[PDB]
Ligand binder design. Structure first.
Ligand SMILES: CC(C)(O)c1ncc(-c2nc3c(cc2F)nc2n3[C@@H]3CN(C2)C(=O)c2ccccc23)cn1
Lengths: 147, 139, 128
């Protein structure tokens, strides 16, 4: 007997270099029990507590002249207040000292439990899609699990 | 168990050399309701949604470049191919510590094999119990 | 189905668990969650550490979930935030066969670095 628990696990489209497009129409990606993926956002089918999680992986070849700041943020767009409200956020400075060139890898993980309402849209965005590494699978993803 | 939900929680062997070997015959480790541990891989007993998870803890003394990887893979029985479900790559560089937790929900089939590997077993840390583990929970 | 999801009390200089929190179907909060019936449980948690700059003494941040049936680590991790403000969360989660009456604790070593202002500081169990 399958679970009736709203769950989703969507992955970065590896073809869309220079963008962060979430896919459920990809191997080992899913939407279950009412969760929808609409306009790059997960739509919550019913109210309740949910675990929200996401990982992005950033990669760079050395350290450039201008300082790099990498951000990943998970936003909620409620039906009654249709503006992005941050739930989870994290910032990283991959290069402490600039190159006076070794590849660096910086994962950003976000996860937490939030009360969500029916129709809430969830966004998961980065500031630098040009640094995102999603060629190999399993590195960039975004999911929910209803408690 | 009375729930009958296939579950597993396996732990790393601290005295395994140059490898990340999983064990179920340890305290606070288990294989229940059909899940098997065969060739260092977890074997799924039935089709369904599963929470799949793993934690590794790396540790180094100072900074000498080092790349750390941690990957959960799936070998689907119909396909016979090994693909990453969850993967992290980190460049860590006094002692430094790097925990890596990989978790998510996946549709799995009967007979799928799941693996949890790393590139640097020599950087693993086993100072305390509960620092290196791998598991699944059927929804 | 015995379930529990407690949050931290923002209680100073400590990690006190309290009841978006919920306690139900036998799971009591005696500072440990007490297991009402023998079975399989997913036990999870997250803590969030934060600081400004790096001190002279090397700081190691730990978060551990223990089982008391003796005190044994079930889930544990360590973070070294200093090899500018910083934030370091620690996530734990796994499935465990527990006995009726067992106690489960979720502790940190450095509550002075805990962030008391989020959906990232919690401790919970779900009977499967
Ligand atoms: C449906 C099922 C199997 O009963 C179930 N119920 C609840 C959860 C649950 N897991 C949590 C959590 C809050 C939760 F309610 N907070 C954490 N976890 C674990 C570890 N860690 C922190 C993570 O960040 C994480 C990242 C992906 C995946 C699981 C985790 C997971 N699975």
């Amino acid at each position: 007997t399958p679970s009736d628990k709203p769950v989703a696990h969507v992955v970065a489209n590896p073809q869309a270099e220079g963008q962060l497009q979430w896919l459920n129409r990809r191997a080992n990606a899913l939407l279950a029990n009412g969760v929808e993926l609409r306009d790059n956002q997960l739509v919550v089918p019913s109210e309740g507590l949910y675990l929200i999680y996401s990982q992005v992986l950033f990669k760079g070849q050395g350290c450039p002249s201008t300082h790099v700041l990498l951000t990943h943020t998970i936003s909620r767009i409620a039906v009654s207040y249709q503006t992005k409200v941050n739930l989870l956020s994290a910032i990283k400075s991959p290069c402490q000292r600039e190159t006076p060139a070794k590849p660096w890898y910086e994962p950003i993980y976000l996860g937490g439990v939030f009360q969500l309402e029916k129709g809430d849209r969830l966004s998961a965005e980065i500031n630098r899609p040009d640094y995102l590494d999603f060629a190999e699978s399993g590195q960039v993803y975004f999911g929910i699990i209803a408690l």
